[PDB]
Amino acid sequence: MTVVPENFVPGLDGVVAFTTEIAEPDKDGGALRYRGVDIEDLVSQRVTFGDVWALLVDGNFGSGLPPAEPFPLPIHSGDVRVDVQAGLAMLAPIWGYAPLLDIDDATARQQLARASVMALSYVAQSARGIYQPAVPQRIIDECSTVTARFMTRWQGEPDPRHIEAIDAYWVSAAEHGMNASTFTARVIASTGADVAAALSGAIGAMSGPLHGGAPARVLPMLDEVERAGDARSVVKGILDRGEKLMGFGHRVYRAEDPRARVLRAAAERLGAPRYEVAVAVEQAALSELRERRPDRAIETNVEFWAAVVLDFARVPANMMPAMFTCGRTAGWCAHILEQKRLGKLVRPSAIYVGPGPRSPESVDGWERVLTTAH
């Protein structure tokens, strides 16, 4: 049994695994930048998601995400995350993706872009479901952005205001430093595996409820406030019965999350019908939490306004984790390529603290083991 080092912390909390040039969540400064470019300037100027993908991955504009080729989704599992996780892995043999170790940066960059947009197409197809006929490719070819193509392939005739909402949300959710799925993408890429395998594994980590970042589960709250007309009494009733206010908690940035601000502004600008009730809930929830526990720094989670914006765009609640996955594909691809250029296998250690040497016959249940001596 080995001694545990004095400085050991479980979960690698606060342990630096990489340096990165991709994006800076400036929590002290209250700002988020992608390759130096402020997120507010990207969203406010309505830079489309396909261009922000290229910015994060390449470090500049000029080679946006291309449209998806026609490819009917082969997986129908009843879960969107499963469909895209399995379907992406299956791309490597049919498309001829070699291991990352065997290809140059340019080929890796092309495979990342080709697979990244197919992930969005797969999500749109899986969301539309098997009980509807597909949207013809020539209808989707009318669109001029990838986001508009995604909304058309899914909804057929989407409101242009809802297309704008998704574009704001995806840009705001594209990248945010190291997290379990970004980390998983880099670990798999560090083995030299193909890019589809890395994206597939990252989707698996994204699906975990403790990953963080998924749109908050706030729709029953906003329904409870619509029908009662009083946000503060609802907010107090939730807290007084022992429940938790979804979408609010400890600060992430110094104060307001810059992403929460752009999504509140988008919901306002695009006229989301739930906007006022959501703002009334925000005021009442911050008020109640801040006087109940005035030592804690409490702020609105961006995830609160993520759910508002997606609900506006007609995204069902059980589809919101998939929409988060779709925007984060930009950051996943940027980190995969950065990890490719790094060329270092990720390999931490483990310390053994279990039982010492012992015979099989000393282990509980050995008598219930059948072995042949033929």
Of 43, 73, 118, 197, which one interacts with a second copy (CB under 8 A)?
Answer: 197
Q: Which region, judged by CB under 8 A, interacts with a second copy, from 54-62, 111-119, 230-238, 306-314?
A: 54-62
Question: What residue spans of 31-136 are helical by DSSP H?
Answer: 39-44, 49-58, 80-89, 91-95, 105-128
| DSSP per position, 130-177 | TTSPPPPHHHHTT-SSHHHHHHHHHHSS--HHHHHHHHHHHHHTS--S
Of 175, 194, 288, 311, which one interacts with a second copy (CB under 8 A)?
Answer: 194
Q: At which residue do the structure tokens 């479980």 appear? A: 10
Which residue is catalytic, options 6, 157, 250, 291? 250
Q: Give how far Cα 224 sits from Cα of 170, 227, 273, 292, Å.
A: 28, 6, 15, 22
Residue 356 per-residue DSSP state: -
Q: At which residue do the structure tokens 């990890």 appear? A: 339
Question: From the CB of 67, what's the least distance to a second copy, in Å?
Answer: 14
Q: Measured between alpha carbons, how far is 35 from 43 in angstroms, rounded to an integer? A: 15
Q: Per rule CB under 8 A, is residue 357 in the interface with a second copy?
A: yes
Q: Per rule CB under 8 A, is residue 266 in the interface with a second copy?
A: no
Residue 249, classed as helix, strand or coil, is: strand
When the beta carbons of 100 and 260 are compared against a second copy, the nearer one is 100
Neighbours of 23 (CB within 10 A): 23
Q: Per rule CB under 8 A, is residue 242 in the interface with a second copy?
A: no
Q: Is 291 labeled as catalytic in the residue annotation?
A: no
Amino acid at 46: R
Residue 304's nearest CA partner among 219, 185, 191 is 219
Q: Which residues 134-163 are close enough to bind a second copy by CB under 8 A?
A: 144
Q: Is 335 labeled as catalytic in the residue annotation?
A: no
When the beta carbons of 46 and 292 are compared against a second copy, the nearer one is 46
Beta carbons of 344 and 64 less than 8 angstroms apart: no
Q: Which residues 160-189 are close enough to bind a second copy by CB under 8 A?
A: 177-181, 183-184, 187-189
Binding mask 71-90 for a second copy (x = CB under 8 A): ----x-xxx--x--xxx-xx
Q: Give how far Cα 283 sits from Cα of 199, 231, 248, 253, 299, Å.
A: 39, 9, 11, 19, 11
- Which is it for the CA torsion 261, 264, 267, 270, positive or negative? negative
Question: From the CB of 202, what's the least distance to a second copy, in Å?
Answer: 8
**Any residues with CB less than 8 A from the CB of 259 and at least 6 apart, and which?**
32, 39, 172, 173, 302
Q: Measured between alpha carbons, how far is 116 from 110 in angstroms, rounded to an integer? A: 10
Q: Per rule CB under 8 A, is residue 372 in the interface with a second copy?
A: yes
Q: Which residues 296-355 are close enough to bind a second copy by CB under 8 A?
A: 342, 344-355
Q: Which residues 101-120 are close enough to bind a second copy by CB under 8 A?
A: 101-102
Q: Which region, judged by CB under 8 A, interacts with a second copy, from 36-44, 103-111, 220-228, 319-327?
A: 36-44
When the beta carbons of 83 and 224 are compared against a second copy, the nearer one is 83
Of 49, 67, 143, 204, which one interacts with a second copy (CB under 8 A)?
Answer: 204
Of 6, 10, 227, 271, which one interacts with a second copy (CB under 8 A)?
Answer: 10
Q: Per rule CB under 8 A, is residue 363 in the interface with a second copy?
A: yes
Of 211, 232, 251, 269, which one interacts with a second copy (CB under 8 A)?
Answer: 211
Question: From the CB of 182, what's the least distance to a second copy, in Å?
Answer: 8
Catalogue the active-site residues. Answer: 250, 303
